[PDB]
């Protein structure tokens, strides 16, 4: 995917690598080497008038 990664405050269980938001899309990952939880924020976009 495409997005901005930031340090997350989410507490993932030992068997959880990914998190989901209220609309059932990915909003967090566990780094496979550091085991840090990172939040994913889509890069800013919008309309142009």
């Amino acid at each position: 995917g495409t997005g901005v990664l930031t340090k997350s405050n989410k507490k993932f269980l030992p068997f959880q690598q990914f998190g989901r938001d209220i609309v059932d899309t990915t909003d967090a990952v566990r780094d496979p080497q550091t085991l840090e939880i990172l939040d994913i924020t889509p890069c800013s976009f919008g309309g142009v008038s």
Partner: protein, 49 residues
């Protein structure tokens, strides 16, 4: 008029209240406080944290 004397008819509850920064009447202020709106048309770049 600044006098606001109408022969005993008190319109203070429907006329703008200058004390409030929105200059809405007490009834209008009450009506705005009663309705709950989350889908604001404001710029929303204050989440993702």
């Amino acid at each position: 008029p600044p006098i606001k004397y109408f022969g005993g008819f008190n319109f203070s509850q429907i006329l703008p209240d200058p004390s409030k920064p929105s200059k809405r009447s007490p009834i209008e202020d009450l009506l705005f406080n009663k309705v709950t709106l989350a889908d604001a048309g404001f710029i929303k770049q204050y989440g993702d944290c």
